[PDB]
Amino acid sequence: VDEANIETHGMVPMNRLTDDPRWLPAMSERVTRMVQRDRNHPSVIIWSLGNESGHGANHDALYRWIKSVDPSRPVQYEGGGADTTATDIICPMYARVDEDQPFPAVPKWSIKKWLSLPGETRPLILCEYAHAMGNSLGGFAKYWQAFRQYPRLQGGFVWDWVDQSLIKYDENGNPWSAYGGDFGDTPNDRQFCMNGLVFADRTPH
Amino acid sequence: MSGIFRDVSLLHKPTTQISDFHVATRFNDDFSRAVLEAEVQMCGELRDYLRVTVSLWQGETQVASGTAPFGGEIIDERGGYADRVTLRLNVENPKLWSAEIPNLYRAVVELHTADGTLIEAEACDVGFREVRIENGLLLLNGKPLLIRGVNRHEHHPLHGQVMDEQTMVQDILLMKQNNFNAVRCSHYPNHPLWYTLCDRYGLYVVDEANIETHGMVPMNRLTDDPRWLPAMSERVTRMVQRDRNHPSVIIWSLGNESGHGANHDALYRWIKSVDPSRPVQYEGGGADTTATDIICPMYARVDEDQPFPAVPKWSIKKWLSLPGETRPLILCEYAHAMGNSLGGFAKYWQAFRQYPRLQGGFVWDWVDQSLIKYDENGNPWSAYGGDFGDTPNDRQFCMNGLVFADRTPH
Amino acid sequence: DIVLTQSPATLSVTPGNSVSLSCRASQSIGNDLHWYQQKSHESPRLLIKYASQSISGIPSRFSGSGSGTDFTLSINSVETEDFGMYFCQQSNSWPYTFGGGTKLEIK
């Protein structure tokens, strides 16, 4: 799944820039160039508009652009509720199997339920699920089982591969795994950068 | 059983009379206004001095009235019906009928001459309600129902299959007391009074054709045969002609467990044409055929699938999201209440509550079909299958009610 | 419980004339109101059931009407054999209850 380099997670609301025509051009280049460059690879089967940038008119335009230019692949974008008009696939992050999380504006229905909401017909594939931070992955099987029982549940992307820890050295040139704020970095999210299934050295959790 | 088990009557009609009439109600976007539309047909000699008046009462208060003489609009190249007339009454801010509040009006249809002389009159209760499937949901007056229903047979431990007002009423009240909204006429048209009571006390009714060929192999055998088309046809058409004016009836059903045949498809289309005010349902042949507006399986589990060949029963939550599927799902029978039962009932209630397109179902069933027998000392006791030297038989299988035959609860 | 009040308590009439007897319930009982006739030294006799339903073997001159809380038993052209007591009874709710009765006498 090839994804545009666009994430404006920190704006309030999330939409703020993506809904602004003045950012349309800048955004536009992040999508178009990606496509012009990677379009000939067979491994790429889905295009994604970015991540966590809410849902703005800029997405709608860019999604249409792609569809026009390269109809060989589907487009996906999770922002703004996971099922907007800018995505060909319902692609939420952290939706539970059986329980709903109905946040205002952007709820996360139980995946089995999400599919049969009135009028809905797209396939559902989770862009992120099963947050693998530290001693984790409980319930992983529940997911696998739904995937297997419901056709329209075509799997998902676990979050994530490697721990984003970095190497630091001690008083005796001894290395150790560092994380958020360990570089006197401010402000910071500490361990939040370690959610991999494998350690930074590629040794498995 | 057998015999003359419902009433016998004599009716004396004028020579020039009302042969049929139907009612219909249309609404505006917010239900603040309705149109009552009545189509009347007559038999006999058509004389220009003939008139029809349709009046709508609400209590003692006349709400609307309309008068006209026979003769409809042009329908085709040959003209119109000279022996029909359709009136349309406007009703502002009508009180709506529902199982929650059974607002009713009275409609009077008078067939008179122009000098004011009455030839004869007919009437019926009217309930203003709109039933629609929209966007996968079944709506009543614009909101989506959640059917808390049960299947009920016409059964009396003493009288066999003869129904009486007292019994009907008892049943109704028990149901309402116990949180039921609706009933399914498993599996044939019921005694006439039934609709009237439902109309009045407030229960949604699914009216079902008297057609069940469960015992054929395969199930389809007759229903797929053009030679049975006529016979079947009459079981559907007459039901509709008779019950169509009752507000409590909100869904028509083609019968039960008769597989899925071309005869169903035709009959389903017929209904849709004739009375588009209600949806049609039929479970045979897989529960989701082309002959049903609603996925209406029997005994589908909540979470587990039962994938029988040809006619699997998916888990209800799953059934809805099968590719291409968009209809609402309401179980025609679920939670088999035979003896010490009802385990898991709550699982159902919870799905119903979490999934919109899961609009409930009909429990199976209301009363135990046990009969009264007497002993060596004129002492009564509850009898069942095979207790009458009956062969072949299904024993206890006739006892799946929520209440005992005497109407005492399980 | 449901209380049934009958009026008048006594009614005098000359054979040939018609009369109507009243029975009112303390609360709605739908159509579950029945009418009985009772003569001295005799068991009650059902005349009308469920407000207006006819009974086989009863003279046609007896008719019933009403619903909810107000009911009426009418006798078209009273005959001498009609003199006696008349009671209404409701079966809508348990316990079933009877009205206090109306005595029909010759005038």
Side-chain angles (χ1 to χ4, degrees), chain B residues 116-285:
Chain B
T117 305
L118 225 219
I119 284 85
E120 104 193 307
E122 305 275 359
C124 76
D125 296 327
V126 167
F128 275 85
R129 28 109 273 203
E130 192 194 60
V131 198
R132 287 154 62 202
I133 297 195
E134 153 152 305
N135 199 37
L137 296 169
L138 178 70
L139 309 176
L140 182 91
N141 301 334
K143 328 250 250 138
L145 285 184
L146 181 37
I147 297 315
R148 299 147 148 88
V150 60
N151 282 274
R152 153 186 193 285
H153 259 104
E154 286 179 331
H155 178 92
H156 195 294
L158 283 154
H159 301 142
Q161 305 161 348
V162 174
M163 286 307 299
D164 62 86
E165 169 173 2
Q166 307 314 321
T167 301
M168 293 181 216
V169 181
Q170 206 188 3
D171 281 347
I172 290 169
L173 308 180
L174 283 176
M175 298 190 197
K176 292 219 105 203
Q177 278 172 27
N178 282 279
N179 302 321
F180 289 95
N181 247 164
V183 65
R184 178 181 171 216
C185 305
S186 43
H187 301 295
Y188 41 69
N190 273 200
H191 181 301
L193 192 59
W194 188 244
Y195 311 84
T196 282
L197 302 184
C198 290
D199 280 349
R200 297 172 175 168
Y201 280 95
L203 279 181
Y204 302 122
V205 177
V206 170
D207 208 14
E208 194 161 278
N210 185 19
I211 304 165
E212 174 175 355
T213 75
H214 206 152
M216 305 287 301
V217 187
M219 215 196 301
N220 232 190
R221 188 143 230 138
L222 303 185
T223 57
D224 212 30
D225 182 345
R227 325 179 334 255
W228 291 72
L229 174 47
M232 291 199 223
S233 132
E234 297 229 302
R235 296 174 173 251
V236 177
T237 53
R238 319 177 60 233
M239 176 181 65
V240 171
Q241 316 213 256
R242 176 188 97 169
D243 299 345
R244 65 136 111 217
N245 296 317
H246 276 297
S248 46
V249 176
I250 63 172
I251 286 160
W252 304 112
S253 152
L254 295 189
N256 189 67
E257 52 198 11
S258 308
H260 177 227
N263 310 338
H264 289 115
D265 291 314
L267 296 176
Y268 162 96
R269 225 305 127 169
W270 183 82
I271 302 194
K272 307 290 273 151
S273 282
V274 164
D275 172 28
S277 105
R278 286 160 170 122
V280 180
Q281 68 153 77
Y282 178 63
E283 174 264 352

Side-chain angles (χ1 to χ4, degrees), chain A residues 88-123:
Chain A
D88 286 340
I89 296 168
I90 309 179
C91 53
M93 55 178 71
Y94 325 101
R96 278 140 195 223
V97 173
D98 274 298
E99 56 167 313
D100 306 327
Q101 312 174 73
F103 311 123
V106 284
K108 290 207 214 275
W109 306 124
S110 121
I111 60 183
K112 332 229 233 198
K113 171 194 175 132
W114 204 323
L115 294 161
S116 26
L117 249 29
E120 217 4 276
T121 60
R122 286 165 292 180

Side-chain angles (χ1 to χ4, degrees), chain A residues 13 15 24 62-63 75 110-111 116-118 148 157-159 189 196:
Chain A
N15 232 190
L24 174 47
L62 296 176
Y63 162 96
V75 180
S110 121
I111 60 183
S116 26
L117 249 29
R148 307 182 153 97
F157 294 86
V158 163
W159 184 277
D189 298 292

